[PDB]
Design a protein around this nucleic acid. Structure first.
Ligand SMILES: [Zn+2]
Lengths: 101, 183, 110, 96, 90
RNA sequence: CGAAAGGGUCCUGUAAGCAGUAGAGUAGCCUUGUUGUUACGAUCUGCUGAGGGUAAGCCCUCCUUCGCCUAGAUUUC
């Protein structure tokens, strides 16, 4: 079940992208950038319980360990194993390259 | 001006076509149409959507390793303008397009080689299972061809195969129902 | 040049005739446009449809009319006494492999 | 429909023709913006009654590209050759 | 020039070259069989309305002699040599 | 001119069926495991940007077919 499914495609209801999640996993600086764009006092569990793969905060360690056994987290893990779509793959799909000399 | 490519499906994006999504990390995503834009907003994977160049490249249905595809690139180092260089470049693009098209046709034929053998095997299996559905003579036609062959001293097999050729040439369909005669 | 008694097989594109029609009227409207097609094709105001053709039209409910149908229209003499019309059309459904890709064809008398 | 910077030899008619009009096989006038009529409608073109007062009337127009893609949808190809070059070889191409 | 030399090379080892009556006959026979199958399926779909009502049993409907002779003639059986007129009731 | 058809242009997203040392696992027969083997089994892969639709207010077709035609009625300084 999705909360307010009528307007889930609106820009103000947008969630984090999979390539951004890959860069967050690969680089802690990118994850730090994303976390400084938020306020720690408004986050669930004071921001201390965060799943990077789901890009989502939780109220407790019990809730985080709980969602890890669920299928949305496993769906995110399978999508990350497959690899997110990027501009490099978009260029390689049409046979386009960058010539820097 | 120039020709962009759609991020989602790889189709050519001409000016005033589609829409661009500007992300707060600093990435621009150009979409040729609202179909690609709405699939992106629904977070569908172009590599999984079968109508995309990304899927076709992943599945190996596009010619990707070829010498004619190494001529087009994003040139980040500009070259001073030279009229003869641009004219010979135009001639190069025309010849490269012809060569790439004919190599792509060869690639598609190498992809689609085995169809004839598969179809022949399926046809043999279907014929062996349904020999009784092949066209044949009617009983009255057999009777009249036998009596004509007896009268004219000709080959009943010859008249049978001639009538088979005529019935193969003349194809007629069947209509459902039929009119009820009024009293 | 063409005699009064002649039968031809046509393909009727009912999709463009039923485009935008109310769902509860699509099959009766399809029957009416089949009658109109037969009248325009053969010049006969008296058109009689086969019950098997009616079943073929109504096969998928009141709003499931096929896009194309293969029919045979036969113009015959009406021999009943005191007849307003000397000719009439009888329209039947034709058993074909697939109704697309077929031309209008004269049915042989034999 | 070809310009000095677009060397594609093509006519003004879009791919698949103008929607609900057909093809333009005669002389044509390109007018900036919109005009009061609809498709197929007769139009009267008239000289301006007064001498112009704007720099826009004295400007020289330099076209770089003219769209000739299909207006029957989201047309992404200016020419049928471009469409076949992007698509590749189809099943009906070998079937023919 | 490298692309050209590769092109006449591929012409030299024939990268672009292009290549049975019994096979064609068996495909035509299979196509005829598929058409017959489609006609049989269309006949069944015409005569079946099992969603709304049951099909009347065949033993409750008496068959026409003309239809039986036409079907046996199409199947290839001489009706005069077996005499269906005597078997048909009145 | 009309009805079909063909080609184009768009829309969707890869048809039915067949096959597969793809498929988590389970159960049989024996070489008792050495893709042991056979069976079933969401799904996946190939045939297949395939199948389906396309004017109903899309385009083209003296040159792809079939049909129609110089009417009828009424009125008019
Ligand atoms: Zn796109």
């Amino acid at each position: 079940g999705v909360f307010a499914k009528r307007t889930m495609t609106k820009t103000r209801r947008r969630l984090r992208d999979l390539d951004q999640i890959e860069r967050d996993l690969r680089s802690p600086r990118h994850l730090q950038q994303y976390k400084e764009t938020k306020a720690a006092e408004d986050l669930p569990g004071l921001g201390l319980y965060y799943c990077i793969e789901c890009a989502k905060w939780f109220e407790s360690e019990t809730s985080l360990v709980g969602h890890r056994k669920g299928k949305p987290h496993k769906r995110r893990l399978k999508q990350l194993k497959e690899g997110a779509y990027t501009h490099e793959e978009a260029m390689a799909a049409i046979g386009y390259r960058i010539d820097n000399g | 001006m120039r020709i962009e490519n759609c991020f989602f499906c790889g189709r050519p994006a001409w000016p005033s076509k589609g829409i661009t999504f500007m992300r707060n990390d600093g990435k621009a995503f150009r979409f040729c149409r609202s179909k690609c834009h709405k699939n992106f907003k629904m977070k569908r994977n172009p590599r999984k959507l079968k109508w995309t160049k990304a899927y076709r490249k992943n599945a190996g249905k596009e010619m990707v390793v070829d010498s004619t595809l190494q001529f087009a690139a994003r040139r980040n180092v500009p070259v001073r303008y030279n009229r003869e260089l641009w004219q010979k470049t135009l001639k190069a693009m025309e010849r490269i397009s012809e060569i790439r098209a004919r190599r792509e046709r060869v690639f598609y034929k190498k992809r689609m080689a085995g169809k004839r053998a598969r179809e022949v095997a399926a046809a043999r299996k279907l014929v062996a299972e349904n020999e009784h559905l092949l066209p044949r003579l009617r009983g009255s036609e057999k009777r009249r061809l036998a009596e004509l062959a007896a009268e004219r001293g000709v080959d009943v097999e010859e008249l049978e195969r001639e009538e088979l050729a005529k019935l193969a040439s003349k194809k007629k369909s069947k209509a459902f129902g039929g009119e009820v005669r009024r009293v | 040049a063409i005699a009064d008694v002649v039968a031809r097989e046509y393909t009727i594109h009912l999709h463009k005739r039923l485009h935008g029609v109310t769902f509860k009227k699509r099959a009766p409207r399809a029957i009416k446009e089949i009658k109109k097609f037969a009248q325009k094709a053969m010049g006969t105001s008296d058109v009689r449809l086969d019950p098997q053709l009616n079943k073929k039209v109504w096969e998928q409910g009141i709003k499931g009319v096929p896009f194309r149908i293969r029919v045979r229209i036969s113009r015959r003499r009406n021999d009943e006494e005191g007849a307003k019309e000397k000719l009439y059309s009888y329209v039947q459904a034709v058993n074909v492999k697939n109704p697309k890709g077929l031309l209008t064809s004269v049915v042989e008398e034999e | 429909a070809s310009t000095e910077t677009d060397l594609t030899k093509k006519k003004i008619t879009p791919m698949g023709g103008f929607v609900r009009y057909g093809e333009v096989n005669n002389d044509y006038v390109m007018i900036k913006g919109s005009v009061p009529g609809v498709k197929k409608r007769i139009m009267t073109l008239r000289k301006s009654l007064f001498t112009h007062t704007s720099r826009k009337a004295l400007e020289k127009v330099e076209l770089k590209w003219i769209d000739t893609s299909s207006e029957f949808g989201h047309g992404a190809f200016q020419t049928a050759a471009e469409k076949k070059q992007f698509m590749g070889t189809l099943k009906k191409d070998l079937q023919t | 020039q490298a692309l050209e030399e590769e092109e006449e090379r591929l012409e030299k080892e024939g990268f672009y070259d292009e290549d049975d009556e019994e096979e064609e006959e068996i495909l035509q026979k299979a196509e005829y069989i598929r058409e017959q199958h489609a006609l049989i399926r269309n006949e069944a779909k015409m005569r079946k309305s099992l969603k709304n009502r049951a099909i009347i049993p065949r033993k409750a409907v008496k068959k026409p002699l003309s239809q039986l002779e036409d079907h046996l003639d199409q199947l290839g059986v001489d009706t005069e040599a077996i005499g269906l007129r005597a078997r048909a009731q009145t």
